[PDB]
Design a protein around this ligand. Sequence first.
Ligand SMILES: Nc1ncnc2c1ncn2[C@@H]1O[C@H](COP(=O)(O)OP(=O)(O)O)[C@@H](O)[C@H]1O
Ligand SMILES: Nc1ncnc2c1ncn2[C@@H]1O[C@H](COP(=O)(O)OP(=O)(O)O)[C@@H](O)[C@H]1O
Ligand SMILES: Nc1ncnc2c1ncn2[C@@H]1O[C@H](COP(=O)(O)OP(=O)(O)O)[C@@H](O)[C@H]1O
Ligand SMILES: Nc1ncnc2c1ncn2[C@@H]1O[C@H](COP(=O)(O)OP(=O)(O)O)[C@@H](O)[C@H]1O
Ligand SMILES: [Mg+2]
Ligand SMILES: [Mg+2]
Lengths: 313, 314, 320, 316, 315, 307
Amino acid sequence: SALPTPHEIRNHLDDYVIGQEQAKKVLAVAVYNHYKRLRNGDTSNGVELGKSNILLIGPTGSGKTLLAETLARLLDVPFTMADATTLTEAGYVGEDVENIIQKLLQKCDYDVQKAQRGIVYIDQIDKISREGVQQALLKLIEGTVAAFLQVDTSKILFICGGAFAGLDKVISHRVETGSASEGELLAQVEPEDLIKFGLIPEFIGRLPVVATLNELSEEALIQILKEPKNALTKQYQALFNLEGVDLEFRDEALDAIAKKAMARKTGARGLRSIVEAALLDTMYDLPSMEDVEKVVIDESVIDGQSEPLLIYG
Amino acid sequence: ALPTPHEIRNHLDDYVIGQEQAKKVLAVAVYNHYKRLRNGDTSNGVELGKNILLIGPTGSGKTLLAETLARLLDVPFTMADATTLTGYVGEDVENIIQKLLQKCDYDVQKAQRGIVYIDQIDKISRKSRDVSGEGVQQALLKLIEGTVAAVPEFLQVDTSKILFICGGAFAGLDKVISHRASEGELLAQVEPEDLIKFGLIPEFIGRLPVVATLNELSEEALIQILKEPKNALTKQYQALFNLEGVDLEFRDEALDAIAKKAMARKTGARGLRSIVEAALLDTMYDLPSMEDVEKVVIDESVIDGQSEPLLIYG
Amino acid sequence: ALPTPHEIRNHLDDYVIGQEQAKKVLAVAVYNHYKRLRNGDTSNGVELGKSNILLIGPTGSGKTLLAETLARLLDVPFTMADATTLTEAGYVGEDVENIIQKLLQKCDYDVQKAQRGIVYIDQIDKISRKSDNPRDVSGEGVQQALLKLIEGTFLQVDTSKILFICGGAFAGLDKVISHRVETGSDKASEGELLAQVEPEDLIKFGLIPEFIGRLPVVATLNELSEEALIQILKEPKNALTKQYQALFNLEGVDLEFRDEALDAIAKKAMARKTGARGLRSIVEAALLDTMYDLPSMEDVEKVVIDESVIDGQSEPLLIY
Amino acid sequence: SALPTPHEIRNHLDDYVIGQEQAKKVLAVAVYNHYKRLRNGDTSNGVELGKSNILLIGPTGSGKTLLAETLARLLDVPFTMADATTLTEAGYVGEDVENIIQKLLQKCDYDVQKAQRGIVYIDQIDKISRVSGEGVQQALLKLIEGTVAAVPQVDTSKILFICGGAFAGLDKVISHRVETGASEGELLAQVEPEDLIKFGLIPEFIGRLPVVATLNELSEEALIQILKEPKNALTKQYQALFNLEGVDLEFRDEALDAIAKKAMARKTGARGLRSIVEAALLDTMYDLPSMEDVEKVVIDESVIDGQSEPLLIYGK
Amino acid sequence: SALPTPHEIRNHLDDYVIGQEQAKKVLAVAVYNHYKRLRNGDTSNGVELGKSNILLIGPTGSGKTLLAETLARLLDVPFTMADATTLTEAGYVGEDVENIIQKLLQKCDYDVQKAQRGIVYIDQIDKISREGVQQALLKLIEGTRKHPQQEFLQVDTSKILFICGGAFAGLDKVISHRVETASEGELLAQVEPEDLIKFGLIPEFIGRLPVVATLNELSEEALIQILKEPKNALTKQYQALFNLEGVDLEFRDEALDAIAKKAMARKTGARGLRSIVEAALLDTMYDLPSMEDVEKVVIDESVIDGQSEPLLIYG
Amino acid sequence: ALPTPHEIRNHLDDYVIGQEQAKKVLAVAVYNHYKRLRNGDTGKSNILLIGPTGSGKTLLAETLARLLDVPFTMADATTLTEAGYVGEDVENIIQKLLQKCDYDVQKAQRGIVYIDQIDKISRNPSITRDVSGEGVQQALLKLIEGTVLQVDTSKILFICGGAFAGLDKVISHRVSEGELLAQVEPEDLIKFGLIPEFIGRLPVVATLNELSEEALIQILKEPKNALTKQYQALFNLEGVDLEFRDEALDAIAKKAMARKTGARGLRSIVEAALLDTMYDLPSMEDVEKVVIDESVIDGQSEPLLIY
Ligand SMILES: Nc1ncnc2c1ncn2[C@@H]1O[C@H](COP(=O)(O)OP(=O)(O)O)[C@@H](O)[C@H]1O
Ligand SMILES: Nc1ncnc2c1ncn2[C@@H]1O[C@H](COP(=O)(O)OP(=O)(O)O)[C@@H](O)[C@H]1O
Ligand SMILES: Nc1ncnc2c1ncn2[C@@H]1O[C@H](COP(=O)(O)OP(=O)(O)O)[C@@H](O)[C@H]1O
Ligand SMILES: Nc1ncnc2c1ncn2[C@@H]1O[C@H](COP(=O)(O)OP(=O)(O)O)[C@@H](O)[C@H]1O
Ligand SMILES: [Mg+2]
Ligand SMILES: [Mg+2]
């Protein structure tokens, strides 16, 4: 079938992820090129090998994991996740690194041809760096056939996410020449700066594409609460719907939740825990009573002193 | 069936004392689960992430809670241990499913409605053998989502519909939370990032959105820990006394007396031994010198320590 | 024929002064341990306690002596190790087994008698990884590495059978127990507190749960009282005073220790918290000058008074 | 004469690597002699014969790694890479180093003999040198020596070892020892084992690396040629990518020159060429599949300034 | 013969070592008692006597090793030295322990009895603490017709006297931490086994070293004294050397002082004395044998400055 | 009679160029040593040679023995490492000294012994079969210290040579390279890895800063793993015979001295002279190649080709 254009890929990412427009443009092109190459074959002349990788650099709860998973759905392609930190410091993990492929081949259902089209996301790669574990990924990225893995890994798409908390410093040290501000600094990121961070030149060489994500602002989280197709509010509204009740979040309440999430520095992943808690009591005794609609205000969220308003019929 | 969360918690009250906030959470999580299973996540134009993570000391009631939930809902229940993790390691995880079918009488549907309790998940992740356990957690994570083939008609069961509860003491988690007696308040502030820092993979945590914490030891739990386990203290001591040709007998009141004292010291299961040892120390010392048929431990011997174990001479 | 705990404690009374509670505990622990071994634990499948012991007491309280004496009384091979040497190494894990080879040496290279052996590890509190007295990664590695020994695994010997006794002073442990046992606003005495000791107290101290779980039997030693030390200076067959008198004897001189001097020595020892181990260094210093110019003089006897010891200012009385 | 001659080997290197003629000549002879020895036999003559290990000294992105990989490909020999810094610090210590032999066996299909022929490239050697780390040099040196047990074995003596390093401080010690009078390429050639001992490498380790090859820093024209000439050249790759769209991508010579200049300012070398090109064509590659034009022309004013977008031409 | 009294022992040490009067008193007693024990026997009058090995604690170049050597010399007893650092970090340390015993037998002529009366000095004991060698040292301290060594092990280490020296740089702080609620020496006098425990020495090891002595840092007046007064003083040695040439070598007091000063700047202690003197006399010793002088005079200008050559007097 | 320090240095000047300072020290050290033996005692003037490889250390030792007409023998610390699987490899060098001496006990005691690569013995062991150099210091020290058919080593003069590559650093830290070595003190050698007991036996310390041509030349041809022999083997696999003219060996040494590189700097010089040749050699077929000094010194002309 036809393959979506980078323009289209980016648009569908806008539906699941708020902001981060620059990173999505990058992913859209990197991904499009990847599959566009795979279809034409390894390469035109046998030279490129048809292997491309992406490196996501952004704060925790910025959307890295979401972006990777979302790309997979849009392209109807097997997706698996792994964590670099669980992997780091183990020898057996080099052997369980193949467990990533034994984890992907489970989700692609041993099709192999589907597995090669698949996408793999490695999280917390910055943590492994202070490198032997990195080699494991390099070997992972590469697969050869002389004519447990039937398909070479070179065809599968690798996306590697990390927070790189110290990287922002090493960037500033190199660009310390004249004659917040985190977003501007990430853009200036170069492979050499990742080397100083502790990533081996070998590993970076195979991660040519570099996308940077900004730290979610207040309004960013608010939009994340409502806009995305599977936004928290939507999810809970559906849950309350099964009870025949209508759940409504006042704008001031959503704002109230975002603020709390920023204070925790948890990012977007800490949004659920906050909402779950605000609606805990209600969801508990709701099945016992019959009301028409429930309204959540900022007072019930931030203070947690006030219970949500109940409207009957 | 499908009792309201209010009804569920009240049923938990009869089995476990205290831990009202945890009960409330389990009630909702379970209710939503089965109410959401019937309807299904599909349709309505929305998808739901949807699993519970029990965090409490040893002998707090976690396991008790899991089993009870299943009994109240007339749903097949199966327990598993993270520290057993029993080359491929793939059958280990599949067994859990198979066992669930055996208990379920081989009904594909009832097995989907089943509940599965995983213990020692905290042990798989260590802060500050290890690899076999963490690899199984990745294999375990792979069995919460997606169907699992029947063991080689082959009408297998989708693993997603099954509810998964994971219990763990998480001794080191207490510290990481405070860095990010009266520990309960710290537990409430627990967040998915604290789990990450503890050693839990992000993908796993994301699969366990619901988190329940316990702030008090469970009396019955300890009582059962004293006699039920194969390595139970009571059995260990009855064995020692048996080499002397003596018959050691614990009165139920004595066992309860032991638990209540352990709870007052917040020592937990580990603090049970020091209490039993102290109760039999004098006896064990002058036992090999005298000749009696059996010896009986009563609550008056434990709590007050005033009375010594009753001797029966023959 | 195994000795009843009554008998084991009685013979410990001959070599060790005080610590009656700890001796009762060791007596039971030991008896049960070998009682289990000799009956081959349990045929088929039954449960049996490891019976490993954790000695907790101040320096020079008798921990080492108790361990050594236990072995002698049971005519069983005995070997000592120090947890400090162990810490910090992967190579020391391979050194940990060295403990076993040494046990085999004293054991005549007999595998079964080695299984009967007793192993005492000193300064276990030192390896504990904690903020107090602040390498951590390495010390823990030993706890875990030595932990494997405790359970039991080209000698071919299995350490399960061998009895483990781990001693430590646990200087900080006293505070952590008080912080827990306290009520409202204290505790009578350290000895009274060490009794209230729980595994969770050892946990906060720095010991890992899996390790403590392998040390079920916990014995606690009291700080030897003035009168104990004093007895240790006189009563034992190789008592310090007896050794120095013998020395002064081959000089033709008679050495006399006044009771006030012996008590003066005990007090010094208690202020230094060194226990009995600190006794000799104290006596030595008090007789140093005397022994130096002794072979040059020609007197009948020398009398040690309190004033010579405590003040260290006056010289011993010389009688001609 | 079934084995490739040094002449033959260098020529093959010229296709993958641009410039560094002097280093290529040394590698060619070092390698040829190494295998020439293996085929006849090790120390067959009464006279003691020492295996020749290579030590590549050159700035980052000079071609060190590439040269090592290319050598193995020409000889149809198993090649594995390791990193001095990755192995510098490990709980397992030198035991790990053996695992690299395991890696050589993986590529090798676990053929003992083929692993012998294998080539091993160690990167960032300059890093371990200051110091218990320098002990790892000993563990790494013992490999060069040989007799390490394999997983079954593998004679590390027969295996060829190439050690690459930037040696940023080396330039100074060379000019210091000689007292000297730029001239970087001239100073590197003057390098001696004693300059490396002063750098921090143990004498026993440098003694096992008899062959020393130095690389000049890339010329302005070197980069330009690297962009165009090599079979795996960037321009060729992007042109191919743009061709899948049916579009013809063309780089103005002024543009290639513009790219090289940027790369030199970064000091990144050839490695930083792709990041520069990627950024220039990023926007165009994003919205290209949405529009239909015959060709795109990349000029220097679109690269350097990044101000103007590429020229779009509609073919008819 | 008769055993030398501690009084005698100390006086003999006074001739080879300057100062450290306190340490010498200690060593004198420890040594006397030790050999007085061997002659009488391990057991005396129904009571077992305690072996009194010695631990020397002093700065580098203070006289620890010399003290050890000198003791052996005045007792006419076999002496061997060993270094704790060579042993550590290896499994073959235990074998090297036997190597030390072998060394003692060599100088001893392989006379087992003479070897058991010998003395062994272990240097840099402080370096071994942050310990398995402490276990090996402990065991060694405790005691346990053929041209070859045959029964080399017929000798047990029980009888041998072990002296352990160390600078213990960190020990000075550990002692201060317990006192709080030359000048360094006053801190070292208060040293207790407990302090050595904290330093890294295992309790079982310190219990085998019941005798502890301390040395003071060497003052400038001390170095000057060392240059002239000992029996084997540097000045005396060179004077004897110049004496073979029929020349009289004279050191002016200001010169001896100049040497000391220079020695203190290098902080080598008495060790760096010889190298300073040899350099000052090198040129002179080189061209001496080819000229006829009555005597040669070394002034401070010749030593410290090195600018002027020694004064040459003709006869 | 006995040669004056003046006479001894003069005889050393004819064998080794430069190193005037070390030659003085050795002269006095040796003179005093034998002057103390003569006329009887009434005792260690042992020497420690610190200099780069190819500096003349070994040559100076030999030369001192010949002018004194005294038995001489060399030993290698590296070889003495193992000290033999059984026994002392050390006692072997006293036997060698006696053989050269015809087994005359006295002449042996007058003898001179040179131990090379002492800096190598100083110290993860990783259960290595090879003996620890730290222990070798002891085995070597047992030798220096007199024993007790029977020979006492106290009377024999010991000279220990070494490069001490790391020593230059240690001395700069304690506070160019030539002037630094002059400031060497026993403390530096202890920090290097030499035990205080060993250093105490080596009171005299001499330093060499420049290389000697004769030594370099010898190192190029004599050793069994000599550069010339290695390259000849290489060219031999090609069926070609490689011949180094003596004038070319001398030309190589000069180059190495001018660059103060030392022995390890020789290979880089030879490699550059033969690079082109080895590069296009496998393409042509000739009987032999001849390297002359004009190939080396000027690099002007290419080596001679015989077909
Ligand atoms: N920009 C965004 N728009 C919509 N949802 C988001 C966004 N960022 C994060 N989320 C939501 O929050 C959760 C955590 O985000 P995540 O992808 O883990 O960020 P990171 O990868 O940086 O940790 C996701 O499950 C996702 O649904
Ligand atoms: N209770 C005791 N009875 C007899 N002797 C003792 C006692 N406590 C200590 N000692 C003496 O002190 C020495 C060391 O005691 P030790 O067992 O090491 O105490 P700890 O183990 O607490 O350090 C012994 O050799 C012994 O003679
Ligand atoms: N001399 C060269 N000629 C052609 N391409 C080069 C050259 N040097 C580097 N490159 C390119 O740059 C990238 C990295 O080069 P690399 O071999 O890693 O140099 P180094 O080893 O010094 O880092 C490669 O992908 C390669 O295509
Ligand atoms: N107090 C002293 N009196 C005389 N000579 C000394 C004294 N201290 C050191 N020396 C001299 O210095 C040299 C080294 O002393 P040594 O005892 O080895 O140092 P350390 O105290 O570190 O063991 C010896 O050769 C000795 O002659
Ligand atoms: Mg140079
Ligand atoms: Mg001296």
